[PDB]
Amino acid sequence: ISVRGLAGVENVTELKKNFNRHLHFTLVKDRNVATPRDYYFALAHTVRDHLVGRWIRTQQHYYEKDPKRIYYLSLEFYMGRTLQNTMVNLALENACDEATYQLGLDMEELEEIEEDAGLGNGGLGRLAACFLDSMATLGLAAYGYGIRYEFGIFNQKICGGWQMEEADDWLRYGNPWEKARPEFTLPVHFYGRVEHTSQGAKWVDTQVVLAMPYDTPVPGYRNNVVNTMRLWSAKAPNDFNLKDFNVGGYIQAVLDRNLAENISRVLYPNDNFFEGKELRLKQEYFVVAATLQDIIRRFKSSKFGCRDPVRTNFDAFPDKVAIQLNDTHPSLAIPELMRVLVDLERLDWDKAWEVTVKTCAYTNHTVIPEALERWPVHLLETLLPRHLQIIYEINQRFLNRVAAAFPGDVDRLRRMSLVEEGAVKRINMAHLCIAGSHAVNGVARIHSEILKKTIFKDFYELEPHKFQNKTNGITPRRWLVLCNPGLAEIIAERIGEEYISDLDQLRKLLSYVDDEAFIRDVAKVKQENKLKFAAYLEREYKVHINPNSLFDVQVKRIHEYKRQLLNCLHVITLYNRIKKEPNKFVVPRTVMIGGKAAPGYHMAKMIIKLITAIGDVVNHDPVVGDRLRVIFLENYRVSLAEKVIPAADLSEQISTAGTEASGTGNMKFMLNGALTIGTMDGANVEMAEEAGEENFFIFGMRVEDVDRLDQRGYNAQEYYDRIPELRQIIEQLSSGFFSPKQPDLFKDIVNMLMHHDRFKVFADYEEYVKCQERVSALYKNPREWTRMVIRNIATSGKFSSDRTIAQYAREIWGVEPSRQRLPAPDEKIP
């Protein structure tokens, strides 16, 4: 059937009865009233059974051996479905497929019932998920810590061409994967005030919110390792949240509990955009405060909570603990770790600081200003009084270091301050992380260089040793084996299976670049993938596409910097050229654009309307025929990604040079047989470098060109004046060609493009369409297109998250990865 494992005689039999056990005893249903949803759950529970045994021994193991623990703090974990992935990592796929088949059910149909765990916005959240899978696969004692939002990223609905947001009630039917652990609930404080008494400061009169943990297993790839992802849920104490007496109403007191519990209610739907709301700050401290108590408790036991030097010496804390900050969201971990160490454990400042810096590491994910976290002091002042005092003290000593290093450099001092003066004072969370971490890293080579050259230049000059780079990656398991079994199979037929956990081995595929059978095969799976997607499209969304055309897709969050607008300009151009010479042949294309716009991002929502507007015109022009279709992919999310990417021919990674930190979708397309048209931005540079620029479609300004243009000054009118095709498009938008009933509907877009385009869309227009012509040329030559594809796939090895994690492990955490199978799952009950 494929290498989805063995369909053993004994195990298929065993699976079936357990499937039935759960259907009866767990779901309390009988075959005569069971629905596909019920069947999905019976299976989910059956599969979940297979990893609890392993989950328990793994955790027990780490308790015995006591290795250094890695704590990944992130406010986002874009998990997606977990049934299939679990079967894959446990080598259960074929057996389950067989068993469910014999039970008369279609496993694939059941898999579609699983709701996505959308606790993330996009790139940042998904990275955390790929990281977890890699850390488990590499045998690291790692823990993912976050918040269990009951409402993840909103589900997107297109009404009349506009995006409509609606709550993502992903827990409505329950989550068979998590395990509530109410017995490990911890308290978290808010507000209050600081008392300075005799021997130390005291955080007093605080409001308490309880943090209840929920564990979700994270299985490594076929190594019997199952790590844990702990998500915190907000709960109100039953005392004060009722006991603070003297009139108000008993009923009202109980109803008001949903005020402390709102903390974990919903994820902020912003991608690369900072919103300074109190609720957000509350979420950030909540995950930090709870997690740290858990971290220290585990440390206090270790082998110190037995003997060792005997005396809670936190000197070995950094040797046993490592906490990674996914961006600045969990930045309060630094001042909080100090608070605990100094205020509660009573360590001197300097000893506490040394420990903190040695255990904390910060990862930067963006350079755009509107995404940078700068919290107003009055907010920290009211909500976390002691933490503000600690930050000021950290700032004081840091700046003193600076003054000593650069005597007289008074401007440098204000520039490096963690505190920003002006309208309202703010705290620069990024500056805080750099100061309190022993390592700071970018997520791609160019992004990391930009940090040292620009944004954190002064910091780099002060402590050059702190700065590193760790190019992002993706997990080959979900992003290849899971979503594209067809391609994984033909690859395995030639080079084996060892590449799933050693993607570098994909290079061996280079020697088949001229193999006639392979070229035919690679081309076949892609054709099958395109047919399956073209079908899914009419199944769930309804209105036909042509599987023979070039599948041009751009899927990512909607942003001005991602330039979906540039993509739009090209599409309209193609249309106009066809309308000019109708009977001229052109390579057919189905351009698919999908992504979510943050609810408050007006422009982004305006772009979504433009896309659909274009499709309205283009898709109903009889002269165009099936040569050009414009489709907006609704509710783009992980599960949808697993469907389009494998079916894509052209991958669009067209951000303005210097704005996309790294990107990861790009990597997903490269590993799945799509060719990339893009700018020298983020990881695109390293991808072209790995596959050879001749096998990549690069165009547009490089970072330097962008800066040159900024010195000069960017004037869009120039481009409008010298390019007739471009002029024609702008006037079509301005006159209502795409919006008859509402002629001025797109005035904001036009106005912005001509007068305030922060991402110079026009500057890259000419080189972009020229380059697009080159891909169409190559598409006309199937054999060569596929051979170039083989060049990309065979050279994408470097972009596996196993490589990234191996690097974090050695160069930052100080731990050695291991591909050693944990001693089987075998029963055991001590």
Ligand X SMILES: *Cc1c(COP(=O)(O)O)cnc(C)c1O
Residues lying near a copy of itself in the complex (CB under 8 A) are found at 20, 24-25, 28-32, 35, 37, 49, 52-53, 55-56, 60, 151, 154-155, 164-169, 172-174, 179-180, 182-183, 235, 238-239, 241-243, 245, 250-251, 253-255, 257-258, 262, 265-266, 268-269, 277, 279, 599-600, 829-830
**Are 526 and 649 contacting, i.e. CB atoms less than 8 angstroms apart?**
yes
**Are 697 and 675 contacting, i.e. CB atoms less than 8 angstroms apart?**
yes
Phi, psi (deg, nearest 5) at residue 302: 25, -120
The distance of Cα 126 from the centroid of its chain, to the nearest Å, equals 2
159 assigned ligand-binding residue: no
Task: Check residue 682 for interaction with ligand CR1 (CB under 6 A).
Answer: yes
Tokens of residue 342, six digits: 């100094």
| Cα–Cα distance measured from residue 144 to residue 161, given in angstroms and rounded to the nearest whole number | 38
Helix (H) / strand (E) containing 442? strand 440-442
Q: DSSP label at 448? A: H
The CB-of-27 to a copy of itself minimum distance in angstroms stands at 8
Does the annotation mark 365 as catalytic?
Answer: yes
| Cα–Cα distance measured from residue 785 to residue 519, given in angstroms and rounded to the nearest whole number | 10
**Are 719 and 709 contacting, i.e. CB atoms less than 8 angstroms apart?**
no
Task: Check residue 637 for interaction with ligand X (CB under 6 A).
Answer: yes
Supply angle C-alpha 673, 678, 683, rounded to 5. Answer: 80
| Cα–Cα distance measured from residue 229 to residue 72, given in angstroms and rounded to the nearest whole number | 9
**Are 97 and 655 contacting, i.e. CB atoms less than 8 angstroms apart?**
no
Query: Which among 45, 329, 478, 556 is annotated as catalytic?
Result: 556
Q: Which is nearer to ligand X, 5 or 665 (CB)?
A: 665
Helices (H) and strands (E) in the chain, counts: 33, 25
Residue with tokens 């993502």: 168
585 assigned ligand-binding residue: no
Catalogue the E-assigned strands of 160-247: 162-166, 179-180, 186-190, 193-196, 201-204, 207-219, 226-235
Task: Check residue 627 for interaction with ligand X (CB under 6 A).
Answer: no
Start-to-end Cα distance in the chain:
39
Q: DSSP label at 786? A: H
Which partner, a copy of itself, ligand CR1, ligand X, none, binds residue 250 by CB below 5 to 8 Å per kind? Answer: a copy of itself
Does the annotation mark 35 as catalytic?
Answer: no
665 assigned ligand-binding residue: no
Which partner, ligand CR1, a copy of itself, ligand X, none, binds residue 165 by CB below 5 to 8 Å per kind? Answer: a copy of itself
CA distances (Å), 336 to each of 149, 206, 352, 399, 451, in order?
A: 23, 15, 11, 20, 26
Does the annotation mark 58 as catalytic?
Answer: no
CA distances (Å), 639 to each of 116, 174, 206, 472, 752, in order?
A: 7, 18, 42, 21, 34
Which partner, ligand CR1, a copy of itself, ligand X, none, binds residue 28 by CB below 5 to 8 Å per kind? Answer: a copy of itself
The CB-of-684 to ligand CR1 minimum distance in angstroms stands at 10
Task: Check residue 554 for interaction with ligand CR1 (CB under 6 A).
Answer: no
The CB-of-180 to a copy of itself minimum distance in angstroms stands at 7
Give the residue closest to ligand X by C-beta.
665
Stretch that binds ligand X, among 162-170, 200-208, 632-640, 782-790 (CB under 6 A): 632-640
The CB-of-227 to a copy of itself minimum distance in angstroms stands at 14
Among 264, 662, 786, 801, binds ligand CR1 (CB under 6 A): 662
| Cα–Cα distance measured from residue 69 to residue 618, given in angstroms and rounded to the nearest whole number | 56
302 assigned ligand-binding residue: yes
Task: Check residue 294 for interaction with ligand CR1 (CB under 6 A).
Answer: no
Q: Which is nearer to ligand X, 128 or 775 (CB)?
A: 128
Among 48, 230, 339, 556, binds ligand X (CB under 6 A): 556
Which partner, a copy of itself, ligand CR1, ligand X, none, binds residue 124 by CB below 5 to 8 Å per kind? Answer: ligand CR1
Q: With contacts defined by CB under 6 A, how many residues of the chain interact with ligand CR1?
A: 16
Query: Which among 557, 629, 637, 791 is annotated as catalytic?
Result: 557
Among 263, 379, 443, 503, binds ligand CR1 (CB under 6 A): 443
Tokens of residue 323, six digits: 């906490």
669 assigned ligand-binding residue: no
Among 134, 163, 356, 472, binds ligand CR1 (CB under 6 A): 472
Task: Check residue 469 for interaction with ligand CR1 (CB under 6 A).
Answer: no
Tokens of residue 676, six digits: 């990339």
Phi, psi (deg, nearest 5) at residue 32: -75, -10
Does the annotation mark 431 as catalytic?
Answer: no
The CB-of-544 to a copy of itself minimum distance in angstroms stands at 28
Task: Check residue 123 for interaction with ligand CR1 (CB under 6 A).
Answer: yes
Length of the chain: 830
Which partner, ligand X, a copy of itself, ligand CR1, none, binds residue 371 by CB below 5 to 8 Å per kind? Answer: ligand CR1
63 assigned ligand-binding residue: yes
The CB-of-463 to ligand CR1 minimum distance in angstroms stands at 23
Supply angle C-alpha 227, 80, 185, rounded to 5. Answer: 50
Query: Which among 562, 563, 629, 637 is annotated as catalytic?
Result: 562
Q: Which is nearer to a copy of itself, 52 or 531 (CB)?
A: 52
- The type of residue at 409 is D
Does the annotation mark 243 as catalytic?
Answer: no
298 assigned ligand-binding residue: yes
Using CB under 6 A as the binding rule, the residues of this chain from 304 to 343 that contact ligand CR1 are: 327
Does the annotation mark 741 as catalytic?
Answer: no
Stretch that binds ligand CR1, among 140-148, 206-214, 523-531, 661-669 (CB under 6 A): 661-669
CA distances (Å), 669 to each of 351, 533, 568, 751, in order?
A: 48, 15, 20, 34
Helix (H) / strand (E) containing 337? helix 333-339
The CB-of-636 to ligand X minimum distance in angstroms stands at 6
The CB-of-591 to ligand CR1 minimum distance in angstroms stands at 22
Query: Which among 477, 559, 668, 787 is annotated as catalytic?
Result: 668
Catalogue the E-assigned strands of 467-525: 467-469
29 C-beta neighbours (distance < 10 Å), count = 17
Using CB under 6 A as the binding rule, the residues of this chain from 126 to 145 that contact ligand CR1 are: 127
Q: At a CB cut-off of 8 Å and minimum separation 6, what does 702 contact?
A: 657, 680
713 burial via Cβ count (<10 Å: 0-12, 13-18, 19+) = exposed
Tokens of residue 722, six digits: 């010298």
* Nearest Cα to Cα of residue 179 among 128, 227, 231: 231
Characterize 475-499 residue by residue with b for buried, 16 or more Cβ atoms within 10 angstroms of its Cβ, and e for exposed: bbbbbbbbbbbbbbbbbbeebeeeb
The CB-of-645 to ligand X minimum distance in angstroms stands at 8
Task: Check residue 563 for interaction with ligand CR1 (CB under 6 A).
Answer: no
Q: DSSP label at 154? A: P
**Are 586 and 625 contacting, i.e. CB atoms less than 8 angstroms apart?**
no
236 C-beta neighbours (distance < 10 Å), count = 19
Q: At 348, is the secondary structure helix, strand, or coil?
A: coil
The CB-of-538 to ligand CR1 minimum distance in angstroms stands at 33
Among 11, 437, 664, 801, binds ligand CR1 (CB under 6 A): 664
Task: Check residue 663 for interaction with ligand X (CB under 6 A).
Answer: yes
Task: Check residue 241 for interaction with ligand CR1 (CB under 6 A).
Answer: no
Which partner, ligand X, ligand CR1, a copy of itself, none, binds residue 478 by CB below 5 to 8 Å per kind? Answer: none
Q: With contacts defined by CB under 6 A, how many residues of the chain interact with ligand X?
A: 12
| Cα–Cα distance measured from residue 363 to residue 122, given in angstroms and rounded to the nearest whole number | 16
For 405-410, the CB contacts below 8 A with 24+ separation are 405/462
The CB-of-420 to ligand X minimum distance in angstroms stands at 29
Query: Which among 86, 291, 612, 664 is annotated as catalytic?
Result: 664
Task: Check residue 665 for interaction with ligand X (CB under 6 A).
Answer: yes
Contact set with ligand CR1 (CB under 6 A): 123-124, 127, 272, 327, 365-366, 371, 443, 472, 660-664, 682
Contact set with ligand X (CB under 6 A): 122-123, 126, 556, 636-638, 641, 663-665, 668
Q: Per the annotation, where are the binding residues for AMP?
A: 30, 63, 297-306
Q: Per the annotation, where are the binding residues?
A: 30, 63, 297-306
> So which residues are the catalytic ones?
365, 556-557, 562, 664, 668
